[PDB]
Amino acid sequence: GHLVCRIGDWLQEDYEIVGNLGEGTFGKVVECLDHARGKSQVALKIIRNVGKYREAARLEINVLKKIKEKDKENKFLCVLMSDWFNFHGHMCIAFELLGKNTFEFLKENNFQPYPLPHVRHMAYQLCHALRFLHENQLTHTDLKPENILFVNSEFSVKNTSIRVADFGSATFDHEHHTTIVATRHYRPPEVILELGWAQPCDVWSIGCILFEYYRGFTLFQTHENREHLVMMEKILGPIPSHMIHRTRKQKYFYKGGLVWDENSSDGRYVKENCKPLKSYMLQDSLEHVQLFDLMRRMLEFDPAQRITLAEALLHPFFAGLTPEERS
Ligand SMILES: O=C(O)c1ccc2c(c1)nc(Nc1cccc(Cl)c1)c1ccncc12
């Protein structure tokens, strides 16, 4: 179960619960203030009191600790842990309080896109943020607009400074890698086909995420693996032959081709809605085709070929940045 807490209640004599920020499958996240940071507001993740979620949070904390000792002064746009503790079996982590995540704001705007300069700056942050993560033997395994926070989402949102949050899935290079790892919508072909994954996973997701920013809607609105693959093929091109010879999950294929009932409800859905990636472009200017060229390289089927965030940052699309955007 959860925790015995209403508003005004105190934790460890530092925080007072002023209200709820959200609640999920892991526990609560509440808004607070601090005695010793004096007046200071924080989001306070509070993991439930069950064995498995506890041991899990611990691993997460280890991640946030590592993030907090490389990012010397904090130029890398990761959510900052300000404190953690074991408040009676419920692991608790104090994060610095931020705005709404890039998806709420998109929902509140009735799912209509951020303009290109908005995207371009968010992409820039995202690449930069995760490249920092990747050069420290990490993979966030759960990127998705819900997990990217605006520092402040005053509204067009006034300031496109963002943060990456919820490292509850971040995995180190030594650690055991689970077979399946992303959010269905942001999950790369190598994971669907169970070919092992690592950092490139993140880049695939990031592509999906930038698509969603630019158009307002999820790129792979799907629920089953087979459909998901078919969407991939229609939008990005045929799945590279060596990836099919190399896959255990052959149920999805026949004679090196995807098995698909085009007349099924998902078949018809795909035919009506899924189009080549180029054709989802709004305008044909340069700063648009550049963005899409980036996205396509981010959505390379083959994770050994897929561009890296270190390479992504050397892209002519980012040329369109404000020098105050630049840092
Ligand atoms: O996991 C983290 O690192 C994490 C870290 C910080 C926040 C967060 C999740 N979620 C917030 N929002 C939120 C919104 C809906 C549901 C839930 Cl459970 C939480 C939030 C808000 C303001 N400042 C920091 C955060």
Numbering used by the authors: 142 to 296, 310 to 481
Give me lines lifted from the publication on this model.
CLKs are dual-specificity kinases that are activated by autophosphorylating their own tyrosine residues and subsequently phosphorylate the serine/threonine residues of the SR protein. Later, CX-4945 was revealed to have a strong inhibitory activity on CLKs; IC50 values of 82.3 nM (CLK1), 3.8 nM (CLK2), and 90.0 nM (CLK3). In order to elucidate the selective inhibitory effect of CX-4945 on CLKs, we determined the structures of CLK1, CLK2, and CLK3 in complex with CX-4945. The overall structure of the CLK catalytic domain contained 12 β-strands and 10 α-helices that could be divided into the N-lobe and C-lobe, which are typical forms of the kinase.
The active site environment of CLK3/CX-4945 was also similar to that of CLK2/CX-4945 except for the valine residue (corresponding to Val324 and Val326 in CLK1 and CLK2, respectively), which was replaced with the Ala319 residue. This substitution may contribute to weaker hydrophobic interactions (see below). The results are consistent with the findings of previous studies showing that CX-4945 more strongly inhibits CLK2 than CLK3. In contrast, CLK3 did not have the entire β-hairpin insertion structure due to its flexibility. CLK3 had the longest C-terminus with an extra seven residues compared with the C-terminus of CLK1. CLK1 had the smallest and CLK3 had the largest pocket size. As described in the previous section, the hydrophobic valine residue (Val324 and Val326 in CLK1 and CLK2, respectively) was substituted with alanine (Ala319) in CLK3. This substitution could result in the weaker hydrophobic interactions compared with the interactions of CLK1 and CLK2.
